[PDB]
């Protein structure tokens, strides 16, 4: 009655429900406020290699999709909450997306551009640039699905504990 051992590389996805990320409601027209906020898991490393999908199911309080004019941005920050300018992976609109099938069919899938990597306290943030006419943001009725851990399409996200030379080279930012 054995399971079979594992690599340290756990191939998963990322979503609001996990206990190391925070959501937050958003007013009308501030890009600067962080809607999402990952934090480092305090001991493990996350790795999002290139070509990684997103599925940002953002809606209003009334269940409707936001205006496609809004632009979504993902961005790395330091261990204090401050971005770097570089390290950005994604800047686009919701008009690109098909909520009906954005996480389904690879033809419609929207992947990152750059690789990305996370130490025990590193942070990624989501920024949402909106006009005034929007109906804000309701995080309870909205969510995200980052990556795929199920399909023969898309890719996953690697997570690992600290191993010696792996972390020796991984801390080389």
């Amino acid at each position: 009655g054995n399971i079979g051992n594992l690599s340290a590389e756990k191939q998963i996805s990322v979503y609001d429900g996990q206990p190391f990320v925070d959501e937050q409601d958003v007013p009308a027209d501030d890009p600067n406020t962080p809607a999402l906020t990952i934090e480092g898991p305090d001991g493990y490393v996350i790795a999002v290699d290139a070509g990684t999908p997103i599925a940002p199911e953002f809606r209003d309080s009334n269940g409707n999709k936001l205006d496609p004019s809004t632009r979504v941005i993902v961005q790395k920050c330091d261990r204090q909450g401050n971005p770097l300018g570089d390290g950005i992976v994604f800047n686009d609109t919701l008009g690109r997306f098909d909520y009906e099938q954005m996480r389904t069919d690879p033809d419609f899938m929207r992947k990152t551009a750059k690789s990305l990597m996370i130490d025990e306290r590193e942070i990624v943030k989501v920024f949402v640039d909106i006009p005034a006419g929007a109906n804000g943001y309701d995080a309870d009725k909205s969510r995200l699905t980052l990556g795929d851990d199920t399909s023969d399409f898309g890719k996953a996200v690697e997570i690992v504990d600290h191993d010696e030379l792996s972390d020796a080279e991984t801390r080389a930012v």
Binding site: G1, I3, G4, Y15, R59, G63, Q101, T104
Partner: protein
């Protein structure tokens, strides 16, 4: 010398277990796949062998004048496959039965964000209806138990959010729900599926019309002989 079978709700034996959870949030055993003497050993492979899970729970309501709508059902509903209208789906998000008339009911429409629905037939005052909607939130995983009854451990301790099984069109290749890890059984040993979430899943409602089992677990697996 191996082959591919499916383990499921009933599958290859009438010893597989199916029970429900508690409302106080702390996980419980939903299903137990016990291995029989019929085989030698059973195998799981995440990322290879498909899996399928249609969860469905129970709600109850009493009727009166103007009760065409059903309220927030304590249940986070999602349009299946992204699709909102019922008959365009791979399966119904929700089903309705009048017990007084003892008949199925057709649904008119839905509001997903308010988690409310609108039927076609106005019920009667003093009448009773039950509803079989999908299950929404919750966290799942597998578990292993020896022949004795002791925990050996889990598999890949990253509980999949339940609504993913509702999101994708499970019946389409390439999108089917696979997981991560593997595990091999032995003779009197039992794998289990465990869950935690607020609402009480249900099987075996005799009054349900569209099948003798409302909710199903299925999983392709490999077997030796």
């Amino acid at each position: 010398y191996t082959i591919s079978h499916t383990g499921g709700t009933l599958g290859s034996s009438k010893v597989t277990t199916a029970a429900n959870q508690t409302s106080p949030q702390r996980e419980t055993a939903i299903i137990g796949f016990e291995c029989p003497r019929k085989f030698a050993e059973i195998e799981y492979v995440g990322q290879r062998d498909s899996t399928r899970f249609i969860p469905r729970t129970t709600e109850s309501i009493t009727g009166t004048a103007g009760d065409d709508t059903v309220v927030s059902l304590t249940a986070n509903i999602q349009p299946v496959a992204g699709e909102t209208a019922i008959e365009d789906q791979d399966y119904p998000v929700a089903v309705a039965y009048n017990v007084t008339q003892g008949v199925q009911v057709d649904i008119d429409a839905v509001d997903y964000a308010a988690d409310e629905v609108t039927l076609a037939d106005n019920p009667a005052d003093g009448d009773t209806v039950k509803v079989w909607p999908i299950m929404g939130d919750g966290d799942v995983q597998f578990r292993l138990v020896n022949q004795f009854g002791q925990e050996e451990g889990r598999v890949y301790p990253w509980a999949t959010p339940l609504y993913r099984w509702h999101d994708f069109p499970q019946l389409k290749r390439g999108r089917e729900i696979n997981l991560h890890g593997s595990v091999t059984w032995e003779e009197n040993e039992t794998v289990e599926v465990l869950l935690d979430a607020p609402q009480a899943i249900t099987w075996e409602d005799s009054d349900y019309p569209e099948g003798q089992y409302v909710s199903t677990f299925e999983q392709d697996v490999e077997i030796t002989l």
